Amino acid sequence: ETFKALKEYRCGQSYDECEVNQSIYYPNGGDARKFHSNAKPRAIQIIFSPSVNVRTIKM
Amino acid sequence: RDFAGREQRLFNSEQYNYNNSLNGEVSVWVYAYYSDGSVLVINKNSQYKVGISETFKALKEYRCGQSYDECEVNQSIYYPNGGDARKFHSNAKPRAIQIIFSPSVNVRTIKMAKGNAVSVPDEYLQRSHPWEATGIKYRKIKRDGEIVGYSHYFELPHEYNSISLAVSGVHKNPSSYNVGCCHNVMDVFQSCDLALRFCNRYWAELELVNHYISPNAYPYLDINNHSYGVALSNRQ
Amino acid sequence: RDFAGREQRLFNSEQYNYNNSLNGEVSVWVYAYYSDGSVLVINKNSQYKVGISETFKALKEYRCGQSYDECEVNQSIYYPNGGDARKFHSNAKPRAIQIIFSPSVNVRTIKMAKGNAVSVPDEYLQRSHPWEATGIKYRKIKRDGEIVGYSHYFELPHEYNSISLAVSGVHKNPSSYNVGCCHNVMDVFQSCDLALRFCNRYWAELELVNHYISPNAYPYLDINNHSYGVALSNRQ
Amino acid sequence: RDFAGREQRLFNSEQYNYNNSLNGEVSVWVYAYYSDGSVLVINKNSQYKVGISETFKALKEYRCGQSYDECEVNQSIYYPNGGDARKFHSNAKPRAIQIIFSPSVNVRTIKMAKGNAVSVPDEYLQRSHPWEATGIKYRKIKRDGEIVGYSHYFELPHEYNSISLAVSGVHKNPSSYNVGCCHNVMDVFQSCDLALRFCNRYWAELELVNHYISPNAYPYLDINNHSYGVALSNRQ
């Protein structure tokens, strides 16, 4: 996934968040009205099924 | 005895050489140029081999935060007079494309499928070879006598230039070790999963050079034929 | 014989001392910190004594020019499962609070009522003392060895930290003259009417420091524990 | 020898008695009842004395997340035929009011200023006493023979019942210690700053009883004359 694809999207509920992205790709590159976008993930968890071979996992 | 000097030159040379090793990246970028002066970039970075494939509709200009008519434009491009569009020429169609590869590609492996608007490489499927080997057309992007990238640039200036596009290249490998043979083939399959994609639309080529090409040390060739990138081999 | 020097030092000392006199201001600020990095400030400035009191709803983030769901969030915070909200945690809830007093406060008079979301100080009214004397928790904000303000900072990092908040302090008075006794009591009642309030939401702590704290010569303690303010007593 | 029993009775009695001490809360609630069956509650909780004051406009129904016409309604209520409203009777006007005090009030100190729509207590300012002492009208809200609160209920069923409203009561003090005399007067001034306010609109009296009155152990008297609250003095 891209950076943008991991951000929160609430279907049925954007211009500012486009500029947030621009300001994250390059410092001071965007015209965003916020210091921290709450649509950014705070954490990630990766889970594999027990059928994986753990030694082959790559990130 | 100038060890700072020696280590600076080795640090840059190691970067050059690592990228060109079989442990390093190969990268492709597709730039689509619109009449409003904005530029869409799609980038993919992967080990072993890399490519990008987009539909006609995916290459058209989209300004996030700023559609029914453009849906009908598409219908009228798939089949003549097939849509109910209120415009002769959509300004969301790209006017030109530039394909850039990293210097770690082998240029002889570059392949391009430049289809029509319904995603057929050469008029009808029955007569289509699925790609063309276009490496001979790529120009060297050079800085300080070093090849920093490879460029293919083509205009789509005619009303009939309505395209789907895919491109692919393989990382150089001047060894006789086949990275896709039985010993490593599953690692190539994993590389498909591990490739990282980026896309964004910049309002102007200036913004593209200043905030995308340059900060990332990427190669670029601008509309005035000026080369951008960073030479590293045996350089301080 | 350097009269410019002497007068500069006296001008600053007079400012320090005037503020600490019974003719001077006492000021309180409440800063609420949101997860988007924005900061709401509420300030009150008054003679004799000063305070601020806000409801749970009043402390939540409001971006002017940029609601039904947040109304239901409130209902679900007043009573568990009492609302029809489409979110587990409202990002409009403050994550932290900082209380700052001017150096003219008497720290021993500081009182705080930190209620629950229905404005009850300590679980049920029947068992609530209406305030706590929290002065012992205030840190000195210092510049150049001078106390420029007093700070109490507390996080609300848990889902259950849903608060109403009031704070109050009295201007220092090392005299035995009671400003609230019969000779001056009506002037204290008028001071209630005369207090000036300010509130605003700044997009970042940077903007708060640059455009609110610093231009006004106010004390501040930032999230990196850095002190801001202006030392004036016997200083040029 | 049943110490669990004894301690349970003392725990409840201590709550009853603490609230009635000079260290405890006194609380007032104003309930405004609308024709759609919704109820606005305003609560204030403070030491020593407490009150609420609202304008005519502030008492009208507001459904958050769900105005020009209602602005003109106001104009036509301030002066007859003064507005351009598209309705004879605004359903946002309250139909009734209930004032409830905590049992820690002294009923003889209760005062109410029930003004007209332009906030004048009795027709013209020149002839207005600024309040009426209405304590004799308050009913005891009782549970198990214990007074859990005091209630004044009045309908506004006529088109001309268009009101501004303020109410105030003092915490009981059967001692001869004057809490507002010189030794404690500044603490009463701080209590003004420390009072906590709450307001909310519940869709039905059911929701008000279930999610506001009952969870908080507050007194209430419903439209069927049923009493709610918790008796604590010498009770398990």
mmCIF file of C-alpha atoms in Angstrom, chain D residues 36-199:
data_model
loop_
_atom_site.group_PDB
_atom_site.id
_atom_site.type_symbol
_atom_site.label_atom_id
_atom_site.label_comp_id
_atom_site.label_asym_id
_atom_site.label_seq_id
_atom_site.Cartn_x
_atom_site.Cartn_y
_atom_site.Cartn_z
ATOM 1 C CA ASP D 36 -42.244 18.094 20.900
ATOM 2 C CA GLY D 37 -41.715 16.410 24.250
ATOM 3 C CA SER D 38 -38.002 17.289 24.463
ATOM 4 C CA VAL D 39 -36.571 18.890 27.628
ATOM 5 C CA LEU D 40 -33.665 21.299 27.967
ATOM 6 C CA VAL D 41 -31.833 21.099 31.272
ATOM 7 C CA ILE D 42 -29.461 23.720 32.652
ATOM 8 C CA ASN D 43 -27.555 22.787 35.851
ATOM 9 C CA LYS D 44 -25.168 24.797 38.007
ATOM 10 C CA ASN D 45 -23.303 23.418 41.019
ATOM 11 C CA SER D 46 -21.367 25.655 43.385
ATOM 12 C CA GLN D 47 -20.350 26.226 46.981
ATOM 13 C CA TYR D 48 -22.130 28.842 49.110
ATOM 14 C CA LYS D 49 -24.730 30.049 46.616
ATOM 15 C CA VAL D 50 -25.703 29.238 43.046
ATOM 16 C CA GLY D 51 -27.908 30.462 40.203
ATOM 17 C CA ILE D 52 -28.773 30.439 36.519
ATOM 18 C CA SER D 53 -29.784 33.341 34.222
ATOM 19 C CA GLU D 54 -30.985 32.900 30.665
ATOM 20 C CA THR D 55 -32.394 35.186 27.898
ATOM 21 C CA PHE D 56 -35.660 34.519 26.126
ATOM 22 C CA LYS D 57 -33.755 33.362 23.052
ATOM 23 C CA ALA D 58 -31.520 30.969 25.091
ATOM 24 C CA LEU D 59 -34.579 29.119 26.474
ATOM 25 C CA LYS D 60 -35.986 28.316 23.001
ATOM 26 C CA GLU D 61 -35.509 24.792 21.590
ATOM 27 C CA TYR D 62 -32.285 24.222 19.645
ATOM 28 C CA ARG D 63 -31.711 20.769 18.027
ATOM 29 C CA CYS D 64 -27.976 20.495 17.316
ATOM 30 C CA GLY D 65 -27.115 18.978 13.902
ATOM 31 C CA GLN D 66 -30.702 19.534 12.662
ATOM 32 C CA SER D 67 -33.196 29.789 12.031
ATOM 33 C CA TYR D 68 -33.860 32.913 9.809
ATOM 34 C CA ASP D 69 -37.592 32.453 10.503
ATOM 35 C CA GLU D 70 -36.920 31.941 14.248
ATOM 36 C CA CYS D 71 -34.808 35.148 14.315
ATOM 37 C CA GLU D 72 -37.857 37.021 13.016
ATOM 38 C CA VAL D 73 -40.138 35.212 15.534
ATOM 39 C CA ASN D 74 -37.919 36.828 18.228
ATOM 40 C CA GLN D 75 -38.280 40.261 16.672
ATOM 41 C CA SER D 76 -42.119 39.833 16.661
ATOM 42 C CA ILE D 77 -42.043 38.775 20.351
ATOM 43 C CA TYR D 78 -39.861 41.742 21.504
ATOM 44 C CA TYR D 79 -42.377 44.172 19.963
ATOM 45 C CA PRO D 80 -45.809 43.255 18.563
ATOM 46 C CA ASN D 81 -45.766 43.036 14.746
ATOM 47 C CA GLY D 82 -41.995 43.807 14.856
ATOM 48 C CA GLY D 83 -40.871 40.845 12.777
ATOM 49 C CA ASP D 84 -41.430 39.135 9.460
ATOM 50 C CA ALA D 85 -42.154 35.601 10.745
ATOM 51 C CA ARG D 86 -44.040 32.914 8.844
ATOM 52 C CA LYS D 87 -45.757 31.465 11.940
ATOM 53 C CA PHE D 88 -48.227 32.467 14.620
ATOM 54 C CA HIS D 89 -46.687 30.333 17.385
ATOM 55 C CA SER D 90 -43.131 29.074 17.483
ATOM 56 C CA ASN D 91 -43.025 25.470 18.700
ATOM 57 C CA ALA D 92 -39.475 26.253 19.938
ATOM 58 C CA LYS D 93 -40.966 28.248 22.804
ATOM 59 C CA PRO D 94 -41.032 26.413 26.084
ATOM 60 C CA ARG D 95 -44.430 25.379 27.319
ATOM 61 C CA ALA D 96 -43.348 24.978 30.936
ATOM 62 C CA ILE D 97 -40.525 25.391 33.376
ATOM 63 C CA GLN D 98 -39.469 23.426 36.375
ATOM 64 C CA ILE D 99 -36.925 24.771 38.899
ATOM 65 C CA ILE D 100 -35.294 22.263 41.129
ATOM 66 C CA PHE D 101 -32.916 22.896 44.002
ATOM 67 C CA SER D 102 -30.788 20.429 45.933
ATOM 68 C CA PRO D 103 -31.810 19.750 49.527
ATOM 69 C CA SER D 104 -28.796 21.730 50.678
ATOM 70 C CA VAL D 105 -30.463 25.004 49.658
ATOM 71 C CA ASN D 106 -32.130 27.205 52.213
ATOM 72 C CA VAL D 107 -35.561 27.583 50.696
ATOM 73 C CA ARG D 108 -36.125 30.996 52.258
ATOM 74 C CA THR D 109 -33.210 32.408 50.202
ATOM 75 C CA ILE D 110 -34.574 31.299 46.807
ATOM 76 C CA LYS D 111 -35.104 34.288 44.437
ATOM 77 C CA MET D 112 -36.444 34.349 40.901
ATOM 78 C CA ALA D 113 -36.384 37.103 38.283
ATOM 79 C CA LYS D 114 -38.928 36.004 35.587
ATOM 80 C CA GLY D 115 -38.692 38.746 33.078
ATOM 81 C CA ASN D 116 -40.420 39.608 29.845
ATOM 82 C CA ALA D 117 -38.864 38.877 26.459
ATOM 83 C CA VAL D 118 -36.672 42.059 26.667
ATOM 84 C CA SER D 119 -35.327 41.006 30.082
ATOM 85 C CA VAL D 120 -37.361 43.434 32.300
ATOM 86 C CA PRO D 121 -38.631 41.822 35.560
ATOM 87 C CA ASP D 122 -41.971 43.678 35.895
ATOM 88 C CA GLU D 123 -43.162 45.589 32.793
ATOM 89 C CA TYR D 124 -40.787 48.599 32.998
ATOM 90 C CA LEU D 125 -37.456 48.832 34.749
ATOM 91 C CA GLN D 126 -38.505 51.912 36.670
ATOM 92 C CA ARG D 127 -41.164 49.935 38.642
ATOM 93 C CA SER D 128 -39.377 46.547 38.864
ATOM 94 C CA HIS D 129 -38.180 44.906 42.007
ATOM 95 C CA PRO D 130 -35.380 42.796 40.623
ATOM 96 C CA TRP D 131 -36.609 39.503 42.064
ATOM 97 C CA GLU D 132 -39.373 37.672 43.881
ATOM 98 C CA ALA D 133 -38.810 35.309 46.892
ATOM 99 C CA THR D 134 -40.718 32.250 45.709
ATOM 100 C CA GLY D 135 -39.642 29.666 48.296
ATOM 101 C CA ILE D 136 -43.158 29.257 49.720
ATOM 102 C CA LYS D 137 -44.177 27.804 46.329
ATOM 103 C CA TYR D 138 -41.568 25.029 46.320
ATOM 104 C CA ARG D 139 -42.789 21.509 46.946
ATOM 105 C CA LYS D 140 -40.730 19.002 48.733
ATOM 106 C CA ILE D 141 -39.552 16.163 46.502
ATOM 107 C CA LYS D 142 -39.534 13.187 48.886
ATOM 108 C CA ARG D 143 -38.293 9.572 48.772
ATOM 109 C CA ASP D 144 -38.888 7.291 51.714
ATOM 110 C CA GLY D 145 -39.907 10.274 53.892
ATOM 111 C CA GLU D 146 -36.658 12.157 53.123
ATOM 112 C CA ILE D 147 -36.535 15.522 51.341
ATOM 113 C CA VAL D 148 -34.327 14.911 48.310
ATOM 114 C CA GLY D 149 -35.009 18.239 46.586
ATOM 115 C CA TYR D 150 -37.257 21.237 46.130
ATOM 116 C CA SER D 151 -39.485 21.878 43.051
ATOM 117 C CA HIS D 152 -41.255 24.881 41.492
ATOM 118 C CA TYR D 153 -43.226 24.049 38.390
ATOM 119 C CA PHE D 154 -45.079 26.573 36.188
ATOM 120 C CA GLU D 155 -46.724 26.362 32.813
ATOM 121 C CA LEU D 156 -46.454 28.975 30.176
ATOM 122 C CA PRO D 157 -49.589 27.812 28.250
ATOM 123 C CA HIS D 158 -50.586 31.222 26.773
ATOM 124 C CA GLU D 159 -49.266 32.886 23.649
ATOM 125 C CA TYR D 160 -48.199 35.843 25.851
ATOM 126 C CA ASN D 161 -46.009 33.656 28.141
ATOM 127 C CA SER D 162 -42.676 34.760 26.512
ATOM 128 C CA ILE D 163 -39.977 34.881 29.279
ATOM 129 C CA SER D 164 -36.347 35.598 30.373
ATOM 130 C CA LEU D 165 -35.527 33.795 33.647
ATOM 131 C CA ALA D 166 -32.996 33.896 36.479
ATOM 132 C CA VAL D 167 -33.017 32.008 39.754
ATOM 133 C CA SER D 168 -30.732 31.928 42.760
ATOM 134 C CA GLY D 169 -30.409 30.198 46.109
ATOM 135 C CA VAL D 170 -28.017 30.147 49.049
ATOM 136 C CA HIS D 171 -26.645 27.047 50.694
ATOM 137 C CA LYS D 172 -28.116 26.420 54.071
ATOM 138 C CA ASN D 173 -26.184 27.681 57.040
ATOM 139 C CA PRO D 174 -27.890 27.133 60.356
ATOM 140 C CA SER D 175 -24.684 28.500 62.048
ATOM 141 C CA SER D 176 -24.052 32.137 62.935
ATOM 142 C CA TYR D 177 -20.851 32.084 60.814
ATOM 143 C CA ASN D 178 -21.419 34.481 57.820
ATOM 144 C CA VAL D 179 -19.629 32.866 54.906
ATOM 145 C CA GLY D 180 -19.594 36.188 53.064
ATOM 146 C CA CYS D 181 -18.068 38.259 55.850
ATOM 147 C CA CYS D 182 -14.454 39.458 55.791
ATOM 148 C CA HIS D 183 -12.850 36.208 56.873
ATOM 149 C CA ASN D 184 -14.269 34.173 53.973
ATOM 150 C CA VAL D 185 -15.537 36.721 51.381
ATOM 151 C CA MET D 186 -12.758 36.119 48.887
ATOM 152 C CA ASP D 187 -13.602 32.375 48.962
ATOM 153 C CA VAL D 188 -17.180 33.252 47.955
ATOM 154 C CA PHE D 189 -15.749 35.353 45.072
ATOM 155 C CA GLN D 190 -13.660 32.388 44.034
ATOM 156 C CA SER D 191 -16.760 30.115 44.246
ATOM 157 C CA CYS D 192 -18.277 32.249 41.420
ATOM 158 C CA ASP D 193 -15.334 31.316 39.239
ATOM 159 C CA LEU D 194 -15.370 27.634 40.324
ATOM 160 C CA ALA D 195 -19.063 26.846 39.717
ATOM 161 C CA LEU D 196 -19.575 24.194 37.128
ATOM 162 C CA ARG D 197 -22.346 24.457 34.521
ATOM 163 C CA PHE D 198 -23.982 21.701 32.418
ATOM 164 C CA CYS D 199 -26.662 21.952 29.694
#
